[PDB]
RNA sequence: GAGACCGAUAGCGCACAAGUAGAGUGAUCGAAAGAUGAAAAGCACUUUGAAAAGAGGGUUAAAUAGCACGUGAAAUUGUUGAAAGGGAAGCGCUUGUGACCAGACUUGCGCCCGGCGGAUCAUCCGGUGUUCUCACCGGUGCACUCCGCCGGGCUCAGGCCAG
RNA sequence: GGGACCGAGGACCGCGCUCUGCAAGGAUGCUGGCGUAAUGGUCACCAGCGACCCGUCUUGAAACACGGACCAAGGAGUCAAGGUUUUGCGCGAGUGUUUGGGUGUAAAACCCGCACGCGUAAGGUGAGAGCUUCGGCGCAUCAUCGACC
RNA sequence: CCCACCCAUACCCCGCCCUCAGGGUAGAAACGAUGCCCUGAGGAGUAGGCGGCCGUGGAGGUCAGUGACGAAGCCUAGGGCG
């Protein structure tokens, strides 16, 4: 059915991104995280008041990982065969139509998914 | 810390801070503890201290693992061949130093105590005989243990 | 001999034409896969005894592998279409999987697949009207 | 070692079989066989018909010689005796000479069938040096 | 141009691989796994009459 | 295309000039001077600037500009007379007024709703400088555009009860 | 004739009126530079302007393609919208205000009644298939049994924040 | 007696007890409001607290010194030969087809003659993994005494 | 000299991530066995060593993949996963 399977509460240890050092000061440095290799760098040495560093300690719960706030795991679907592939996982997986799928094929995918009970993440894109 | 105290702490199984253990009083052990004087506080525990330490913070070394002592079956499967089949037997062996005290103490994982409720004395790094917390407090180690638990 | 279900799983666990792999899970497009999940339990084309349930025009078409016909694909699948009652399809499908020892571990999955296909064949409810909120609603 | 270095599916099947046997039996024979299956080629030197023949020259006749290695033929032997040999792989000449002598070629899965605990088995290794 | 574009393979290994491929072609599930639509065909190692 | 796309084209008048050979900075300053004004006021002001009767304030590009009492009309000290930019804006404003006449709008009620000066592709000259260097003289042209337009519950049960009681009493 | 090559800062220096423009007395040195559109159908006519051009109008699927032409990033800039600012800004943790948003829910399941309306109640008979005991058809069934709808009643489970 | 933080697990199994049950191997029951921007989130700003500008180089370390106007694109352990260690694969006292020749759906694939490259043409004492008919057999290899060239 | 009080990433309890270690799992109602279940411990890190993943151009196979009812690129005070 529409409602997802019962699950433990979704806890996110950290909600904001890991910003690369000096990306605020330079426009040539994109915000994507990079490991600082400087031997004197304060962000590498972990001085207080500085940017945090990604670590496995921030890892999300194994039984909660990869699922949306609704509780489904996203599955990228390109066609009616993909939604029929999701047929058996109504309460665990949700369908997400790929960006390159045309309007009529999206309509068909939503129709088959609504027959199957499979939740659609982007059901109202081209309506 | 010098290497001789570093080795004595390793052998007394005091790897962390607030890391109490039981020791059988003897010439060799007393000399070890007297050398490691500047880092530990030791004394003579009583029945209540032993009972509460075993009951609340008692864990066993089972195949090299820390198992909470929730079961007389665990006690029997580990120390049964020495006649210790229950936590009462373990407490008795610890308190009245029996023939198998070495086996009982080693089975007991070193007790990981919390910081005292009430703190230590104003300057904890002198001797108990000089207004501090280090060294041999004969029967006041009981009060320290109530603070630690 | 040289070939078995174990050998086939050894060859095909890492890559199939039926294998679809994404970040949230690995699935299988095989018609003899009752849960569309990549596993030796559910690899129908791998296992000697296997079951598969597909939709019909009104009901469910159930296929099962014939162990004495693995060399003959055109005559390797016992196909029965169950177009009577939901409860009767479940009875027959659970017997085909558990009475004579052909995949009792897949009995539950087969019954669930039949139920899901029948619910899919059931007529579908109209949508609730969409309600706008905040700036969009006042816009 | 948990996974073998080899990519051979049949060696993987043998590894699974003997892992099950080692876990579900009290057999150090099975444990050592699993260990020797996990070791690599340079640590599994070939065993020759000469070495096996002189290891059965004593009262060890009428037995199953198990070697987790490849058995090689030795031209220095004019005669090969009857013998119950099991190994990972044989040479063509080793098979031919054993079968002409009157023995039987055996694989490790077969040896697991007839002798799942290693009874009347002479376990042999080849020259490392 | 001297990049060593070609690979020397033992002929025994080439023949081993060919034999394994023939056995795999004889195996029926492997055709479906490779992506061949073999469901209306009997006798996976098809033999069609030479006179035909 | 025009930057201000929120104005319907049937109710306004427009004018454009591109690759105009006039100082971008001075043209921007005088455009800001005439921004938001009525058409006649802007035309008279630009003519007065040409005649050095009134001066435009230099706000941003105002390095080392002399002080004049005319700047007091703007609450500033740096005022200057960009004659060339004034003439260019007069030309575009008259073109926009002619477009308004063609469209039939009332010319006495038009304001300068949008005016924008952007930088055009730079042009080159070269002069001869000492110590072996040739000094570049890129001229700085600008684009100008302008548009004139006509001047014209989910309350709680407790809250619901409180309101009902207060309405009754 | 080809390629597991390169794809306009690449590939020969040269995909173009390139060994050209240009530099050096000379031997010599030596670049930059591709793309509208299917088709020029490359904007008739009106109006403002000295003109360049602008505004209407028109061609085109598109002028958000006008020969400064495929798509059109950043640096930098203008206009508008919102905001901050007692001798730096920027960055981390945590609220608060304002603006703007993704989810979740719209009820599902199962029992007690009545109205129905239909077609595949149990058992048995023949054929077929199969895991040789399980099914499938066709007949039988004749509607206190099945299967769907409606008008009601009840149970359980259902979102957010809390006591 | 009062307060705070937490509720991990998910049929039964076990230790127990105060045993018609239980506070005994991890939270249930009852109720209310709302069911929508209300919770939640992203941006901008304020507020309290924290917080040296990066890289290179030198030294025990600092300091100095050097590079840094900004952005886009390009940009630096590759290839070959000869050695050598390890891992995977085939054959194995042998191994290597592709110099060349024969087919070919034609630079592919398949097959092969004679050479050639590299390699090859006996114990005792004590341990010892692993077997045993529990009397003992005894891999590899090691220490010593050996035997031969 | 005495009493109470304040707080570190230290110590004690609980949750979660990962790593390591020790066990269980087939006359299979049976498994991405490269899986799953149980228990315990541990977590700074330069040179260096090992492993797994992410991304780009091109090639073989496959998804009987997507696409003028709009591929790719690009923008985004709009979201989701890691």
Coordinates of N, CA and C in Angstrom, one line a residue, chain D residues 13-14 20 30 55 71 98 102 113:
Chain D
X13 N 34.1 -24.0 -5.3 CA 33.2 -25.1 -4.9 C 33.9 -26.0 -3.9
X14 N 35.1 -26.4 -4.2 CA 35.8 -27.3 -3.2 C 36.1 -26.6 -1.9
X20 N 32.6 -26.4 4.9 CA 31.5 -27.1 5.6 C 32.0 -28.3 6.4
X30 N 40.4 -32.5 7.5 CA 39.6 -31.5 6.8 C 40.1 -30.1 7.0
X55 N 56.9 -43.4 -0.5 CA 56.1 -43.2 0.7 C 55.1 -44.3 1.0
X71 N 50.0 -33.9 -9.3 CA 50.9 -35.1 -9.3 C 51.6 -35.2 -10.7
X98 N 49.2 -44.5 -13.6 CA 48.5 -45.0 -12.5 C 47.4 -46.0 -13.0
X102 N 47.0 -50.0 -12.3 CA 45.8 -50.6 -11.8 C 45.2 -49.8 -10.7
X113 N 33.6 -37.7 -0.5 CA 32.5 -38.7 -0.5 C 33.0 -40.0 0.2

